[PDB]
From a paper:
Thymidylate synthase (EC 2.1.1.45) catalyzes the dUMP methylation reaction, involving N5,10-methylenetetrahydrofolate (meTHF)-aided concerted transfer and reduction of the one-carbon group, its products being thymidylate and dihydrofolate (DHF). N4-hydroxy-2′-deoxycytidine 5′-monophosphate (N4-OH-dCMP) is a substrate analog, reported to inhibit the enzyme from bacterial, avian and mammalian sources, as well as from certain helminths. Inhibition was found to be competitive with respect to dUMP, and apparently mechanism-based, as it showed meTHF- and time-dependence; the dependence on time pointed to the slow-binding inhibition. Novel evidence is presented allowing further clarification of the mechanism of the slow-binding thymidylate synthase (TS) inhibition by N4-hydroxy-dCMP (N4-OH-dCMP).
The crystal structure of the mouse TS-N4-OH-dCMP complex soaked with N5,10-methylenetetrahydrofolate revealed the reaction to run via a unique imidazolidine ring opening, leaving the one-carbon group bound to the N(10) atom, thus too distant from the pyrimidine C(5) atom to enable the electrophilic attack and methylene group transfer. The structure of mTS-N4-OH-dCMP complex soaked with meTHF was obtained by soaking crystals of the initial complex with approximately 50 mM solution of meTHF for a few hours. Electron density corresponding to the inhibitor and the cofactor is clearly defined in both subunits. The folate derivative is modeled with 0.88 and 0.85 occupancies for subunits A and B, respectively. The N4-OH-dCMP molecules are situated too far away from Cys189 to form covalent bonds (the distances are 3.07 Å and 2.95 Å in subunits A and B, respectively). In particular, the resolution is insufficient to unequivocally judge the oxidation levels of the pteridine ring and one-carbon group of the folate derivative (PDB ligand code: TGQ), even if scrutinized electron density maps allow leaning towards tetrahydrofolate (with the pteridine ring C(6) sp3 hybridization) and methylene group (suggested as one resulting from the imidazolidine ring opening), respectively. Of note, however, is the fact that the cofactor molecule is present in a modified form, with electron density next to the N(10) atom, suggesting the one-carbon group to be covalently bound to N(10) instead N(5). Thus the imidazolidine ring must have been apparently opened in an unusual manner, on the N(5) rather than N(10) side. Analysis of residues remaining in a close proximity to TGQ shows that the one-carbon group is orientated toward the inhibitor N(4) atom, separated from it by the distances of 3.43 Å and 3.34 Å in the subunits A and B, respectively. Thus, with N4-OH-dCMP bound in the active site the imidazolidine ring opens at the N(5) site, in a striking contrast to the corresponding phenomenon observed with dUMP and FdUMP, the difference resulting apparently from the presence of the N4-OH residue.
Numbering used by the authors:
A (entry chain B), B (entry chain A): 21 to 307
Write the structure that this text describes.
């Protein structure tokens, strides 16, 4: 069965059985608490086909995470503005971060992934050798003890939450190895089904491909687990259109060079093959 | 429609479709990565009936968590020995904790729930006002902003892992409110289907009941999410006996007085009603 039907059944389930629920943005949602889907990574890549996904944004964002950046400007210069609103002067001031330079998202993914527990100052501070490099520790463990049931990268950092422009939606992920296959499970505390979720699925599918390549393993499964899975009210019509389209076979992901360390990946090393999505569907971002 | 069928279906799924997988204890397992079940908390309590669950241990352990204890002795004195091995002189030394008193589990659940980010010294240290009191913060947010999609309690603390006798199996949990009902999702990175999982299900169902009480809400769902869900090889025959038993209706949990703060709950304030499970099934703990 086509993996994308799981995403579609979830959207359908929220539309039929979800409850109306207010939210921080004042937009309102239809919401379900607790969902799980499994996307095979074996000779296919779960880039959704019922709408075109901004794949370039996914790849640049992840490389930006990996090099430890929490500066939206360093991502916007690549032509990816998905974090620009959250780092804007007006939104930062909206949370009391008046002394903060524009673009500074606070101690979010890049900082927690490479520097968990270090003392956060500025997005451009030097943090070399500070905190826990969870990304490299996950990589080292997969190589030396693939049976380990503790292979976790955690972005949720209660001590640092008050400094984040947006507390991470992807609280943590866990990796798992059996039969030479590398699987990943993401715990997403909050999922915008129309905008973020398709993006996030591709993001962690890519991360698994990158780490599988670095560790000499094959991609297995990506398990997507949701807390508050919601459809914003102004996404109902677009998503009702999207459910009527039929999915096309998932594209493939090719890695064009042999890479030795996670840090050496560059955009040019990746190529999506056979991606024939339905047209884009515009959906406004609740801020 | 009996909630326990979900647990029995998962055990069956691992027995049928799980993979052989080596593990830290050297026992070996049949393993599946990524599972989810939903246990209703509405006028029933998911204490499994196809074998007797050690309800006293569930209750004492949670009260021991809530008051912030990391002292296995303080639990063993109540006649609950589930953590004694992990605090034993020999197991501590097996991890290099030669200077530590017996019973000192390190910065595990109780400390992370009440003092996340504090500098751990010994089990007996005074930590009042140090670190983030995630437990009380969860309660405060549920009362003042029940729509919040960030109601999380996280025990996974990458900076403290090297000090823990056992890194937590319950990495984090999230709370959710809709329609006057309080729900909880547990992310459990590793699940011993035979021993811990039935216990753990009761534990977070109980935690949800306690918080629903102090927040003036009704219990909703407990969503149980597993990473490495496994059956130890020496639990297969015991579990195959359990799978042939048919569930009895779940008991009820009563809270016998109005309690105002999570810290004021006491063992005597709880009563399990109508619990007549099938006989106990002996299953050795892989250590
Ligand atoms: C992960 N992420 C970061 C967070 C930031 N805030 C936010 N707020 C809300 N309420 N829902 C969300 O999910 C997100 N996502 C994304 C943000 C925006 C997009 C996005 O804007 N996608 C467009 C394309 C944009 C473009 O092409 O430049 C689309 O596919 O329709 C994608 C991810
Ligand atoms: C959550 N938990 C803590 C962890 C500790 N280590 C561990 N190791 C393994 N490999 N599987 C597990 O799951 C657990 N569980 C429990 C630990 C032990 C038990 C237990 O076995 N108690 C006995 C004594 C009680 C009595 O006799 O009445 C019993 O249930 O019969 C139950 C939960
Ligand atoms: O779905 C999302 N994926 C993200 N990846 O980085 C980031 C955000 N979101 C969604 C989740 C919420 O709809 C919203 C975050 O708001 P919050 O749950 O109140 O924190 O954006
Ligand atoms: O299922 C469990 N529930 C627990 N609650 O506190 C604690 C432990 N376990 C199980 C999971 C593993 O079989 C084992 C822990 O070993 P580890 O996953 O290698 O850390 O005990």
């Amino acid at each position: 069965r086509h993996g994308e039907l799981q995403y579609l059944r979830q959207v359908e389930h929220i539309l039929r059985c979800g409850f109306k629920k207010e939210d921080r943005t004042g937009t309102g949602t239809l919401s379900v608490f607790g969902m799980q889907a499994r996307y095979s990574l074996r000779d296919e890549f779960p880039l959704l086909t019922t709408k075109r996904v901004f794949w370039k944004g996914v790849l640049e964002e992840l490389l930006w995470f990996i090099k430890g950046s929490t500066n939206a400007k360093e991502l916007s210069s690549k032509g990816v503005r998905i974090w620009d609103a959250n780092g804007s002067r007006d939104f930062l001031d909206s949370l009391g971060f008046s002394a903060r330079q524009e673009g500074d998202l606070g101690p979010v993914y890049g900082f927690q992934w490479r520097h968990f527990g270090a003392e956060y100052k500025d997005m451009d501070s030097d943090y070399s050798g500070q905190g826990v490099d969870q990304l490299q520790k996950v990589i080292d463990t997969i190589k030396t003890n693939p049976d380990d049931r503790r292979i976790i990268m955690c972005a949720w950092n209660p001590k640092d939450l008050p400094l984040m422009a947006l507390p991470p939606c992807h609280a943590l992920c866990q990796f798992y190895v059996v039969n030479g296959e590398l699987s990943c499970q993401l715990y997403q505390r909050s999922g915008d089904m129309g905008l973020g979720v398709p993006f996030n699925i591709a993001s962690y599918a890519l991360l698994t491909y990158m780490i599988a390549h670095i560790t000499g393993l094959q991609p297995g499964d990506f398990v997507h687990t949701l807390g508050d899975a919601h459809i914003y009210l102004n996404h109902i019509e677009p998503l009702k259109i999207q459910l009527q389209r039929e999915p096309r076979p998932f594209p493939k992901l090719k890695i064009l060079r042999k890479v030795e360390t996670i840090d050496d990946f560059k955009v040019e090393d990746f190529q999506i093959e056979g991606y024939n999505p339905h047209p884009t569907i515009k959906m406004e971002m609740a801020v």
